[PDB]
Amino acid sequence: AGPIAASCYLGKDVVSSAHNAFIQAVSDLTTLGHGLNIDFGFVKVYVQDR
């Protein structure tokens, strides 16, 4: 997360904490339904119910 913060002109610690909260998308996935399409660019990840 070093170079990412350098390009974003933010602290290194906050970017890592920002990653950690987003990685807790399994709780959103564990609940029923709640389909996902995580693109953020070239690769698109589609998650149906499970």
């Binding site: 974003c8 002109y9 933010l10 909260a21 987003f22 389909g35 399409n37 995580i38 660019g41």
Partner: protein, 50 residues
């Protein structure tokens, strides 16, 4: 959820996902103004995709 409704879901419950991402952080360069809590948290992901 289109990777953006996730942002509201995380921002909706500060107690479940406490951290520095919940509030805005100052930038490392005085030229750039600090961003919104939602705005600063998207711009990290665009950097990660790149």
């Amino acid at each position: 959820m289109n990777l953006d409704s996730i942002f509201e879901w995380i921002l909706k419950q500060p107690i479940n996902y406490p951290g520095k991402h919940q509030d805005s952080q100052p930038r490392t360069n005085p030229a750039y103004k600090p961003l919104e809590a939602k705005a600063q948290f998207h711009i990290i992901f665009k950097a990660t995709g790149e």
